[PDB]
Amino acid sequence: SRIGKQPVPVPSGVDVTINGQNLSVKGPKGTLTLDVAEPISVSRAEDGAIVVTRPDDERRSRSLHGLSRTLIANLVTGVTEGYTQKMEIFGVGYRVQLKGQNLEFALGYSHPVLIEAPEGITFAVESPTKFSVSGIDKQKVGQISAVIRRLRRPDPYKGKGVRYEGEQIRRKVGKT
Amino acid sequence: MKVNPSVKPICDKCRVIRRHGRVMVICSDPRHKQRQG
Amino acid sequence: AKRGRKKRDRKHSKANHGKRPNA
Amino acid sequence: ARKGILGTKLGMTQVFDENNKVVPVTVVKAGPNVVTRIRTTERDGYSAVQLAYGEISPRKVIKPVAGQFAAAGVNPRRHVAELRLDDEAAVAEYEVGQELTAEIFSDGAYVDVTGTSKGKGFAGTMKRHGFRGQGAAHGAQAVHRRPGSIGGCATPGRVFKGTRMSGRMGNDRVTTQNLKVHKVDAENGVLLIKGAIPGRNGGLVVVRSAIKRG
Amino acid sequence: PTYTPKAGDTTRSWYVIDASDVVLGRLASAAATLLRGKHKPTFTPNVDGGDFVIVINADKIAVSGDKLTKKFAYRHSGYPGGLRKRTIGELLEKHPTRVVENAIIGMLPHNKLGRQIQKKLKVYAGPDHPHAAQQPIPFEIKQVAQ
RNA sequence: ACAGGAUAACCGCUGAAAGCAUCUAAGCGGGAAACCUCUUCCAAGACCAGGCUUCUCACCCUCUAGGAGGGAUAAGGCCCCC
RNA sequence: AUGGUUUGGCACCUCGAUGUCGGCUCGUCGCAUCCUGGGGCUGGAGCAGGUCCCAAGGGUUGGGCUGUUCGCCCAUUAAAGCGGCACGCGAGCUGGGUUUAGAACGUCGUGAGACAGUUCGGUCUCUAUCCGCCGCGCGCGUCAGAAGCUUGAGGAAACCUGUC
RNA sequence: GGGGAUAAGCUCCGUGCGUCGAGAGGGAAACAGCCCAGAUCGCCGGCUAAGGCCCCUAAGCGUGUGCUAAGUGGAAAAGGAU
């Protein structure tokens, strides 16, 4: 509603191909895809924006309108800038490095762990205890970041594991 | 995950939602997390 | 249990009109 | 991708290792088989190869079989089995006619054989399936070796297929797996398998590289 | 008295249906109608006099609800604990023909005549068929107003 | 066995209705000795009665030529025999 | 509210016969799960755990006393599961118990004799017609008669775990 | 209405109430007591009740306006819930 009615800004070199409902957005970072369902119309606001439109004000339409808007907003935003999550490895003797594209952890196990880079994202380490995950497809970015986050079973006693940069985790004490 | 046919928003932050045909109580306090079933 | 209940609930059909013998 | 060969069981014996352990080795004489025919996804819909072993004096073979052999060009043989392979990979190394020889294996190679078991006739439960029979004293009225019960009473009122009973055991195809190989003799065309392979001395085996280990 | 078809009476035809996102129930009822012969005026239940049926694009059948993945086809070998089941999705991706067949077979009599009818049912997972030399009549499922 | 697919409880990413929020309502994922494949056995009487092949791949007389019948055969099998 | 296994309520089929406790042998099924496997919360530091969810594939000991089921104990175990199928199974076995006639003790009865009190002893019949089940054959069929090699619908078997 | 636990296909009484008994046929998936209806015999005649009209099963994937997203429909409580 309040989000699904807004038009969406569109800067300069941002080529939007309205092949009916199927939409596809080209910018210097790549040419992303998107699809939508039959009901909702994708009109191009000819001031330099895109606007969603719906026939009905039923449950499905009220739900799906705003979704489509927010998705295309993320889409054009990424192809202009991108997304880059930051993650930070608190611990004792824990560490991260990189091997070309693919990344390497030391997390107390008896073997080390690695990750295969998917097609559309790259890793970027700034220190052995601190890195980022830079991509475009926000789904993918947060996916892989959380997959990392879930390697170490959490431990709120001493503060080990992986943390999203602004993760303020909970804590307790085992005093004895 | 306390499984009970009675769930409630115990504290002030427990939000009551519905996933997949099951009522749930999500909260930052995992003691409070629960569901029907 | 089950058997008696299914008897007593088949009775609520339409061609019986709410009643059957031996329930 | 799966090396197999046909052979004849002979017996069993002992030999020794470098650490002076003893290995109960079974002998097999994989005489040089011949490839009679082939199986492909265009002709037949699967990938395979068809082998031949033995000797017939030329008048004991039948004319259909003599045609199956003379069409492929080669001479008749006793036993004709068929390995089932995966694809062009396992086909591109076979040719009609060519003589296989036992050297295709190497010491340490893990194999699986297949053979027709020995017969035991009309067997009871205590030999098929290893039942505790019943007591030999304390009052037994003639049940010293026969099974017992067979089901319920008016529920089901039947006997539950696969209920185990007496009948002909033996004389079935059987697969024995993960057998190491101790020595190969090229002079005499012989394998010295380890272990203990199915069948009666003078029959037919089929040894293959094992699935779990090949 | 009333007319009863003799031996040299039957006239056959080969019909062909598309299963392009048709509903399984509609399709199957139509085929049962045709095979059993409830569309000709020569109908008699003691005689099989329907028409051959050829179903195509059978892997395009699409159903409603969650029946693709909440619905369970069952079987039983006869042995104990030999009840084994399958969804509809697994069964399409294994072999699609069986879904449509069994669906139709439950819309027929399960008698001798029904078995002798199933012979007259040909089903193919793709768009094609080898039965072009009968020039199969396309059937379009229609509903008569009144 | 190893591995592989779809999954349960569960963990989630993106995100509305409901300006935030939410594992879901559209979608995308990971995930158990259970499930389907894989492993060994049987099996085309699987009546949708399969397939690739090979050999023989040719005689005679009747009923009035109606369609059957009745002979001697090839490939091959069976019986008798060790 | 369940489940229908427990002591009971009704007395609806069976008294021109439905053979009854336990044990053995042999299973097969349910999960409201003993172990193994995955998991959420902790008054969870770690090792051990407590409770809850999913989960049935496999496995789930030998022994002393008692006729005993149940139970208690010993020694181990990864673990020593709960129940159904005429309280599974006697045309498959036992027959210790209970429930024929013998006999004795206590108590009741004047007496014959009785006791959901006790104690020692005491015949377990049958050639499988049909269904069913494990195996094995003859015949016919699959549009000519035959011989070999085989694909795979669909079914079965197996699936356990420990210690350094 | 009593006894019973305000349980029983329980038991005991009432009733110009019923049916079965002694009563077929149709519907109820099969089903003595439920709903319809009370069989003189025949007809390769018609109209209707209860019930039902996607195929099996003869008759409507009938018309109109709205609800349902739960396979509810095609068992169920106290209570819980944007």
3+ Cβ–Cβ pairs closer than 8 Å linking E and D = yes
SS3 D75: coil
Residues sharing a CB contact under 8 Å with residue D76, sequence separation 6 or more, in sequence order: D56, D58, D61, D65, D66, D69
Is the separation of the CB atoms in D124 and D213 below 8 Å?
no
Closest-CA residue to D127 (of D98, D90, D163, D167): D167
Residue D169 CA from chain centroid, whole number: 16
Q: Evaluate if the CB of E84 falls below 7 Å from strand G.
A: yes
d(CA E16, C1' H53) / Å: 28
Residue with tokens 């009775």: C11
CA–C1' distance C22–H37 (Å)?
Answer: 23
- Given resolution (angstroms): 3.4
Please state whether strand F lies within 7 Å of residue A146 at its CB atom. Answer: yes
Q: What is the CATH number of the domain that holds A47?
A: 3.90.930.12
Nearest partner of A117 among A104, A106, A107, judged by Cα = A104
Q: If you measure CA to CA, which chain E residue comes closest to D161?
A: E79
Residue D7 Cα to chain centre, angstroms: 10
D128, D166 Cβ separation under 8 angstroms: yes
Whether A174 is covered by a domain: the verdict is no
For chain D, the distance separating the N- and C-terminal CA atoms, rounded to the nearest angstrom, is 8
E81 vs D: CB within 8 A: no
Domain endpoint, select from A38, A67, A83 = A83
D197 CB and strand G closer than 7 A = no
Domain span at E58? 1-146
Structure tokens at E37: 């012969």
Name D37's bridge partners: D50
In whole angstroms, what is the distance from residue A128 CA to residue A132 CA? 11
Nearest-by-CA chain D residue for E80: D160
User: Domain boundary at A34, A67, A83, which?
Assistant: A83
User: What does R_g of chain A's alpha carbons equal in angstroms?
Assistant: 21
The two beta strands, E14-18 and E137-138, are parallel
Q: Which nucleotide lies closest to B1 by the C1' atom and the CA atom?
A: G40
Backbone angles phi, psi at E132, to 5 degrees: -80, -25
Report how many Cβ contacts below 8 Å link chain D to chain E.
7
- Please name every residue paired with E121 in a beta bridge, in sequence order, or none if there are none: E53
Pairing assessment for the beta strands A22-27 and A30-34 based on DSSP bridges: antiparallel
Length of chain C: 23
Residues A131 and A142 grouped into a single domain: yes
How many CB atoms lie under 10 A from the CB of residue B10? 13
Contact of E79 with chain D, judged by CB distance below 8 Å, is answered with yes
Residues of E in contact with D160 (CB under 8 A): 79-80
Q: Which of residues 1-23 of C touch strand H (CB under 7 A)?
A: 4-5, 7, 9-10, 13-17, 19-23
CA distance D167 to chain E (A): 19
Residues in E closer than 8 angstroms to D162, CB to CB, are 79-80
Is residue E61 packed enough to be buried (19+ CB in 10 Å), middle (13-18) or exposed (0-12)? buried
Side-chain-side CA neighbours of residue E73 (13 Å): 15
A152-161: burial string, b at 16+ Cβ within 10 Å, e else:
beeeeeeebb
Q: How many domains does chain D have?
A: 1
Question: What does the alpha-carbon distance between residue A83 and residue A86 come to, in Å, rounded to a whole number?
Answer: 10
Give D161→chain E minimum CA distance, Å. 5
In three-state secondary structure terms, D91 is helix
Look-up: residue for tokens 């085929």? E31
For residue A88, the tally of other CB atoms under 10 A from its CB is 17
Residue ending a domain, among A83, A117, A140, is A83
CB count within 10 Å of CB D111 equals 26
Checking each nucleotide's C1' against the CA of C20, the nearest proves to be H34
- Whether the CB of D161 is below 8 Å from some CB of chain E: the reply is yes
Ramachandran region of residue C18, left (φ > 0), alpha (ψ -120 to 50) or beta?
left
- Between CA E17 and CA E26 the distance in angstroms is 11
Host H or E run for residue D89: helix D88-91
Counted domains in chain A = 2
Q: Are the Cβ atoms of D160 and E80 closer than 8 angstroms?
A: yes
Protein residue with the closest CA to the C1' atom of nucleotide G155: E77
Identify the domain containing residue A140 by its residue range.
84-164
SS3 content of chain E, % helix, strand, coil (to 5): 30, 15, 55
By residue count, chain A amounts to 176
Count of structural domains within chain E = 1
Tokens representing D149 are 């019960």
Q: Distance (Å) from CA B8 to C1' G47?
A: 37
Where b means 16+ CB within 10 Å and e means fewer, E96-107 reads: bbbbbbebbbeb
- Of D124, D117, D123, D130, the closest CA to residue D174 belongs to D117
